[PDB]
Amino acid sequence: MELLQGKTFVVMGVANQRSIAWGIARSLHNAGAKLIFTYAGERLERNVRELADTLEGQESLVLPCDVTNDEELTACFETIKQEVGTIHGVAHCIAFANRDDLKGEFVDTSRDGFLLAQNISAFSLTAVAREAKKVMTEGGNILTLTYLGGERVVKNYNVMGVAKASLEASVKYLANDLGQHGIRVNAISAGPIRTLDFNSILREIEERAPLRRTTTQEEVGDTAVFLFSDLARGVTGENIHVDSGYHILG
Amino acid sequence: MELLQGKTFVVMGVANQRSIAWGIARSLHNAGAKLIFTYAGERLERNVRELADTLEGQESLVLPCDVTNDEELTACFETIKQEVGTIHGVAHCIAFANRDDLKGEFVDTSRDGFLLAQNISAFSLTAVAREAKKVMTEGGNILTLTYLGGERVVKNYNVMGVAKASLEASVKYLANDLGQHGIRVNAISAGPIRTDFNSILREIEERAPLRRTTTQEEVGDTAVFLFSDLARGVTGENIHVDSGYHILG
Amino acid sequence: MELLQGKTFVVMGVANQRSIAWGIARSLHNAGAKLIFTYAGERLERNVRELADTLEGQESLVLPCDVTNDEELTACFETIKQEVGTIHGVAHCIAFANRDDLKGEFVDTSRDGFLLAQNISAFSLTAVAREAKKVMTEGGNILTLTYLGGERVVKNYNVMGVAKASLEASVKYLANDLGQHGIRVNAISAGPIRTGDFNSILREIEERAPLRRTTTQEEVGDTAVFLFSDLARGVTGENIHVDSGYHILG
Amino acid sequence: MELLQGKTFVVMGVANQRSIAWGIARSLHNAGAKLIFTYAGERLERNVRELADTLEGQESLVLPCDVTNDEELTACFETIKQEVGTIHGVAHCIAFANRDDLKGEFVDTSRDGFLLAQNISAFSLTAVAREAKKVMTEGGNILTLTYLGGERVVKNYNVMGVAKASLEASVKYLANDLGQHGIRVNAISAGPIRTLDFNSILREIEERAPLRRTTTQEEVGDTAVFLFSDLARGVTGENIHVDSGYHILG
Numbered sequence A, D: 001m002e003l004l005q006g007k008t009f010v011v012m013g014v015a016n017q018r019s020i021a022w023g024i025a026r027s028l029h030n031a032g033a034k035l036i037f038t039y040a041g042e043r044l045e046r047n048v049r050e051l052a053d054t055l056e057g058q059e060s061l062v063l064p065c066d067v068t069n070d071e072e073l074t075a076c077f078e079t080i081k082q083e084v085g086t087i088h089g090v091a092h093c094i095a096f097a098n099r100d101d102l103k104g105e106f107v108d109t110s111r112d113g114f115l116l117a118q119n120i121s122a123f124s125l126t127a128v129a130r131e132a133k134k135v136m137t138e139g140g141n142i143l144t145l146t147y148l149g150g151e152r153v154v155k156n157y158n159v160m161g162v163a164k165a166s167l168e169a170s171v172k173y174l175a176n177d178l179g180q181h182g183i184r185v186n187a188i189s190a191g192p193i194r195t196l197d198f199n200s201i202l203r204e205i206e207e208r209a210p211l212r213r214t215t216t217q218e219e220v221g222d223t224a225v226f227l228f229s230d231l232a233r234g235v236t237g238e239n240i241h242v243d244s245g246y247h248i249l250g
Numbered sequence B: 001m002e003l004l005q006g007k008t009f010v011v012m013g014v015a016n017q018r019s020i021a022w023g024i025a026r027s028l029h030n031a032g033a034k035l036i037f038t039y040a041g042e043r044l045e046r047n048v049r050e051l052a053d054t055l056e057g058q059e060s061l062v063l064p065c066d067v068t069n070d071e072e073l074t075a076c077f078e079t080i081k082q083e084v085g086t087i088h089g090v091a092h093c094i095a096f097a098n099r100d101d102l103k104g105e106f107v108d109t110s111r112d113g114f115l116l117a118q119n120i121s122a123f124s125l126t127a128v129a130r131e132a133k134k135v136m137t138e139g140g141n142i143l144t145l146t147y148l149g150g151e152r153v154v155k156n157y158n159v160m161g162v163a164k165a166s167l168e169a170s171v172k173y174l175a176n177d178l179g180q181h182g183i184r185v186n187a188i189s190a191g192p193i194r195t196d197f198n199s200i201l202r203e204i205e206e207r208a209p210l211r212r213t214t215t216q217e218e219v220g221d222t223a224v225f226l227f228s229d230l231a232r233g234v235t236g237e238n239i240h241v242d243s244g245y246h247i248l249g
Numbered sequence C: 001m002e003l004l005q006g007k008t009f010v011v012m013g014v015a016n017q018r019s020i021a022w023g024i025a026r027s028l029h030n031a032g033a034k035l036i037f038t039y040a041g042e043r044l045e046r047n048v049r050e051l052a053d054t055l056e057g058q059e060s061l062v063l064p065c066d067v068t069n070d071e072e073l074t075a076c077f078e079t080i081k082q083e084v085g086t087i088h089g090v091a092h093c094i095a096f097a098n099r100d101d102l103k104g105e106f107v108d109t110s111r112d113g114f115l116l117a118q119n120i121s122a123f124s125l126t127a128v129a130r131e132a133k134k135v136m137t138e139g140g141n142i143l144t145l146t147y148l149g150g151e152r153v154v155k156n157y158n159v160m161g162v163a164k165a166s167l168e169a170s171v172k173y174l175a176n177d178l179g180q181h182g183i184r185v186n187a188i189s190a191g192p193i194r195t196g197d198f199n200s201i202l203r204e205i206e207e208r209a210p211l212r213r214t215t216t217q218e219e220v221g222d223t224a225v226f227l228f229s230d231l232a233r234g235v236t237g238e239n240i241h242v243d244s245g246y247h248i249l250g
């Protein structure tokens, strides 16, 4: 419980108590990290602040950061620079697609919905990484979250599957860029989580996954702790599956 | 010489004789297929018409089809429906990224450049497939072209690498949608083709299992297979035509 | 129908009329090829000779070839060299694992069963390739057959899954060795074919495979025709799934 | 430094100070674990005992265990059960292939060399796991080591490439057997390490790998700490590349 003592991380994408980003924040905090939170729009401001206040110790910076807004993204990380000087990593937990696109067949995905999903779910990793390297002057890790659907076809995941493929390739090209500056870039591929016919999917995982159970936010958060720590200093461009083993199944 | 006898295909992405789409068109023609061509803008219309006329006829069907333009895209396949009724596949050979994005580091890719590369190089396959299934009433194959850079990091490929990854994932989700209508969706991952680039070709010649670079004709002949009934059990596949380079670590 | 005119291939692993090897043999014949057949043991000689006989055109050579026996393997390809002179490829359709190993859990696989499965199902490709390169003096293609279980966990496939993984890695290492001699090495990964509970496997494929049907011998055979032809001259070290697209599913 | 406090691990494959297994042992020790060692040759008995002796806070349990010998492997783990009752994981760091197989072309690999390399480098994981589940009554992790050469073709890796492919598939099939018993199975794919024409290989990694440096035994050991720890409890059937990012390069 001291792996990350003295270190500061930006956690993006907390929306409520069940957010994977909130699982990650709690694990990082338990490992001794200081945290900075961003929130998407004003509607989420109170949730993120309330959750951030439940963390014992120094009270956390909570800033608005729309990752489709280049001016705001830059201002946000300038503010972080002025408030703490140096950060040691970023947790990118941001994704979106229109429900209509996810509901239909993939071939009926709208052009605007495709580009929206790409912009928010894939390009934002790069936009964030570009700002992050300005304040990650001692190196560290950038983490993103992905899903099996970016690798192989998962029912109803459609346009988000293609955006996650884009996200996973971005992880590799970013890793290749930033490594020379001491910065690692990694993904966690999370299995479906009960909190977050969803139930028949959960049942199928409990039945067929090697560990015979579904994933938790805390399992993802604890793998995030490893990736952010010095223990993982040899690991970059990697996608770790925290999914009770489901990914190995044919 | 007759594997594609009696079948009609749409070839997209011809700009000139060095276009890989043109190499594919020649192979398809040699295998007995009738071809319909599309052209991106008016600047390319003369080239595509002339090339088409050397294969098919002055009567060959050559149509405007900017895949960023949804009404022109829809009108194209509407014209195809009215003129020939049924087609048996589409060769999607369309990709674009800004030179500025390809020269810089990937982390410095512009947002507009990224979305542009995604729109033209990845989403276009889906936009085209959506129209094509209206005229592929007997089933058939949709083909796209990709590159190793969509799977692993290749120098200077950057934003196009991420677009090809989108494209290859799209191939899989499209295959899953369209297979029930008898439509297969596949990719060819082509190695670099001669027709600093020269050092890349030299490394391929040195290290690839076949000790030689790829030709447009090798790609076209694999396309012939994928469009033919020989490949009726193959879908959602990515076939590397790259002298075996993809196996190397 | 004349893709393979002027070409001669060795077909290994014909046991009866529903052998995938026989389906491959029919497709190669229909594409204009001359064929040489091997039989694994005396009890199969009559089946193979009679099947070979049903092929119009010149008489087919039918030779003993136990791939666990180096002396016999050498003698087989020595006979081929002397009697036909040049061949243009080999279809390697040979596999074996003990029934008791396949029925238990993989962790309980017998050591002797594991090694036997590896010997027959994986090393034999290399043993065959070593002899075939002597008679493939104008290059060509060596083909082997594999299954999804060599890539991902498939129920009840167990020890054969691990043998197919060795096989698929062998394809890549052989392709890297033999390419400079003009010899390509590829695999076809076939889906289950109709001709524990096997019919429910078939029904799950019919329900969930993109093409909504199971694989036929003839589909595998026609993909073999492509790989043995000059159309595939740019393709080596590849594994083509002829499985109705099932391999893309998560 | 108390991630593995109260836990006991068996480490297999220490040969000397430079062994990756000894890097793993040092990291596990630093995380609070107690360690048990096996040794192969009585010629390695001395090295392993001297190294084990320098672990403060514990006595040595250093046992002969030839993993090709089923009687001895079973006796070794029965002794382990009687001495400590419960172990919480095993580090399987055992590989071997004949030098003559590794220098020649892969196509000239001997049958006996291939089977020997499969027996020692791939099947041994299964034979070890079958014994280990008898003593891992509270669950835990089984770790093995692999190399990029099991996934893609690496110069002169040849027969060991195919053995590692076999090992990596075994990891998946074992993960899917043992998960229901609370036992995870994972691999680390280590990049070349300076201590283990080798110098041009190292130089090219330093030039091309994202992190611009080669791997250390310590980087591998620290990733092992993660995988053996409760932090990795949602992770099984996985292969974590500890290779400075080299695996992402085309």
Ligand SMILES: NC(=O)c1ccc[n+]([C@@H]2O[C@H](COP(=O)([O-])OP(=O)(O)OC[C@H]3O[C@@H](n4cnc5c(N)ncnc54)[C@H](O)[C@@H]3O)[C@@H](O)[C@H]2O)c1
Residues within 6 Å of the ligand: A012, A013, A014, A015, A016, A018, A019, A020, A021, A039, A040, A041, A044, A065, A066, A067, A068, A092, A093, A094, A095, A096, A120, A145, A146, A147, A148, A189, A190, A191, A192, A193, A196
């Ligand atoms: N839920 C799962 O089972 C699952 C599985 C694997 C991966 N993931 C990934 O985990 C991540 C977190 O999702 P979640 O499941 O925790 O749900 P979530 O709703 O709690 O988190 C998604 C976040 O994205 C943020 N976001 C959306 N648009 C934004 C914008 N314009 N600017 C900035 N932020 C924006 C939202 O504010 C929200 O906090 C996503 O990347 C998701 O794809 C989820």
Ligand SMILES: NC(=O)c1ccc[n+]([C@@H]2O[C@H](COP(=O)([O-])OP(=O)(O)OC[C@H]3O[C@@H](n4cnc5c(N)ncnc54)[C@H](O)[C@@H]3O)[C@@H](O)[C@H]2O)c1
Residues within 6 Å of the ligand: B012, B013, B014, B015, B016, B018, B019, B020, B021, B039, B040, B044, B065, B066, B067, B068, B092, B093, B094, B095, B096, B120, B145, B146, B147, B189, B190, B191, B192, B193
């Ligand atoms: N060049 C290589 O080495 C290589 C390697 C592997 C795959 N590929 C792929 O092959 C395909 C063709 O590239 P090429 O090398 O033949 O070069 P190319 O420049 O001749 O082909 C690209 C085509 O994209 C078309 N295009 C661009 N914007 C368009 C738009 N808005 N609407 C419609 N069409 C549009 C152009 O008409 C052009 O013909 C691309 O998909 C490319 O990624 C190329």
Ligand SMILES: NC(=O)c1ccc[n+]([C@@H]2O[C@H](COP(=O)([O-])OP(=O)(O)OC[C@H]3O[C@@H](n4cnc5c(N)ncnc54)[C@H](O)[C@@H]3O)[C@@H](O)[C@H]2O)c1
Residues within 6 Å of the ligand: C013, C014, C015, C016, C018, C019, C020, C021, C039, C040, C041, C044, C065, C066, C067, C068, C092, C093, C094, C095, C096, C120, C145, C146, C147, C189, C190, C191, C192, C193
């Ligand atoms: N059956 C499937 O669903 C399936 C799916 C994918 C791939 N494959 C592969 O296709 C290949 C052909 O198998 P099949 O399904 O046609 O069944 P099959 O039983 O007809 O063919 C396997 C052959 O192996 C031969 N063989 C066994 N031991 C031998 C030895 N010591 N020496 C020489 N030959 C020996 C037998 O003579 C037999 O003909 C195998 O490699 C198999 O794994 C099969």
Ligand SMILES: NC(=O)c1ccc[n+]([C@@H]2O[C@H](COP(=O)([O-])OP(=O)(O)OC[C@H]3O[C@@H](n4cnc5c(N)ncnc54)[C@H](O)[C@@H]3O)[C@@H](O)[C@H]2O)c1
Residues within 6 Å of the ligand: D012, D013, D014, D015, D016, D018, D019, D020, D021, D039, D040, D041, D044, D065, D066, D067, D068, D092, D093, D094, D095, D096, D120, D145, D146, D147, D189, D190, D191, D192, D193, D196
């Ligand atoms: N060396 C590398 O660069 C590298 C890279 C990636 C993975 N690996 C893997 O890491 C592991 C350790 O190798 P290393 O590089 O530390 O070298 P090493 O020589 O120190 O370890 C190999 C071990 O195998 C053991 N072994 C051999 N035959 C045995 C038998 N019959 N019974 C029991 N034990 C037996 C030996 O005692 C030896 O300790 C191996 O699995 C190797 O493949 C090595």
